[PDB]
């Protein structure tokens, strides 16, 4: 009934030293029934990464929408969109559906190509921007993720240390949520290289 918790899933993002990380689980279900273990929730438009939790049809729809918009942006601007700008675009696009919203919990992550500054941001289903320094959480196990991130996280982590912290935040949060898990992916993002790692986790 509650659209935000039919399919299930989670996304988390963290900042580190000259790097950002964004991670997600792979589960898609119909309430109790697990359907897919390959449903990735993180997408990217150029060097800007977007994670989206919530109702799966809207996750897919918004991805297709932001691909559409960032592609036109690039043709006109003659440059790739930056995280700060994309964040405003996500907020604008969500709020235009104020009284008929997409049931989602987006998370933006990336590094500004000019300043080199790491950037993360979260949103509610209708556009409110949460631009945190430390971390952003989203999904059916957001409470769990908040607890994990708030205790595990420390500032200025190196890429390979940040990977361990975010992975353990996601994994242990998902293992306390019935609608999250079934696999996981972690993106480690630096100014000009990105590594994608699939995590081994319990499949129940």
């Amino acid at each position: 009934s509650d659209p935000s918790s039919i399919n299930g899933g989670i996304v988390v993002a963290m900042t580190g030293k000259d790097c950002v990380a964004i991670a997600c689980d792979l589960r898609l279900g119909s309430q109790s029934l697990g359907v897919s273990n390959k449903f990735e929730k993180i997408f990217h438009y150029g060097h800007v990464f977007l994670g989206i939790t919530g109702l799966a049809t809207d996750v897919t729809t918004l991805n297709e929408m932001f691909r559409y918009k960032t592609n036109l942006y690039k043709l006109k601007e003659e440059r790739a969109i930056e995280p700060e700008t994309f964040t405003q675009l996500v907020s604008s696009s969500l709020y235009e559906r104020r009284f008929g919203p997409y049931f989602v919990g987006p998370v933006v992550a990336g590094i500004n190509s000019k300043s080199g500054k790491p950037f993360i941001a979260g949103f509610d289903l209708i556009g409110c921007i949460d631009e945190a320094k430390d971390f952003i959480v989203s999904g059916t196990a957001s409470d769990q993720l908040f607890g994990m991130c708030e205790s595990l996280y420390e500032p200025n982590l190196e890429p390979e240390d940040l990977f361990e912290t975010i992975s353990q935040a996601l994994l242990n949060a998902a293992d306390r949520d019935a609608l999250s898990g079934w696999g996981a992916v972690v993106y480690i993002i630096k100014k000009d290289e990105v590594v994608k790692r699939y995590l081994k986790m319990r499949q129940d």
Binding site: D143, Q144, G147, M148, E150, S151, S167, Q168, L171, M201
Partner: protein, 222 residues
């Protein structure tokens, strides 16, 4: 319509060591967005080296604790001052809770102490009396924030040994009372940051063969 239930907030945490056990809980008491008290004790020494906390609706919590304390008193009268073992107390509490199955004590109960072999013990209850012995358990408002942290940092879940890459698990080495108290404090500091009903103060009751000791720590008052 009259609603006989209420939510007084708060959060509690029980950790069982090898020869000790701790039961912690914040001292803040609330209704809605108001603070009632910054220091309202929630964890109690019930005698016979047993500590107890009934978190949730404080009126039902106080009633249950009061009745259990009374049960300990009468257990001494009826059975020649025999010590009530932690397992026996747990079963007694199940019957107290289930006795009100159709008008429950709206609380998450935890008790802590030592078993008959001297090892650390924590028992956790649901509002209608189902119970289970555990090594680790957080209860109340911020339980969803704390338990995953405890799965990771007490039972070393999802942690493996470097170099093996997922083949060999992190071994389950025992924790000292000093190490446990650090996890408890960090748990409540983290919870205080991201949960509005958690704060003001932290009171920990430590149980050993020597008896019951208390420790108090301040938390943010916002």
């Amino acid at each position: 319509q009259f609603n006989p239930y209420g939510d007084n907030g708060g959060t509690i945490l029980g950790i069982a060591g090898e020869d000790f056990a701790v039961l912690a809980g914040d001292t803040r008491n609330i209704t809605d967005y108001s603070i009632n008290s910054r220091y309202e004790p929630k964890v109690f020494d019930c005698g016979d080296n047993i500590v107890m906390s009934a978190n949730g609706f404080a009126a039902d919590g106080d009633a249950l604790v009061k009745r259990f304390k009374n049960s300990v008193k009468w257990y001494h009268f009826d059975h020649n001052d025999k010590k009530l073992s932690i397992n026996s107390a747990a079963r007694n509490i199940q019957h107290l809770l289930y006795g009100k199955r159709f008008f429950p004590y709206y609380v998450h109960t935890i008790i802590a102490g030592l078993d008959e072999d001297g090892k650390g013990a924590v028992y956790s209850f649901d509002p209608v009396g189902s119970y289970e012995r555990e090594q680790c358990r957080a209860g109340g408002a911020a339980a969803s924030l704390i338990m995953p942290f405890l799965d990771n940092q007490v039972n070393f879940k999802n942690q493996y040994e470097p170099g093996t890459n997922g083949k060999v698990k992190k071994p389950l080495k025992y924790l000292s009372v000093e190490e446990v108290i650090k996890l408890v404090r960090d748990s409540f500091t983290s919870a205080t940051e991201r949960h509005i009903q958690v704060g003001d103060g932290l009171e920990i009751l430590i149980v050993t063969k020597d008896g019951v000791r208390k420790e108090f720590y301040e938390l943010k008052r916002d």
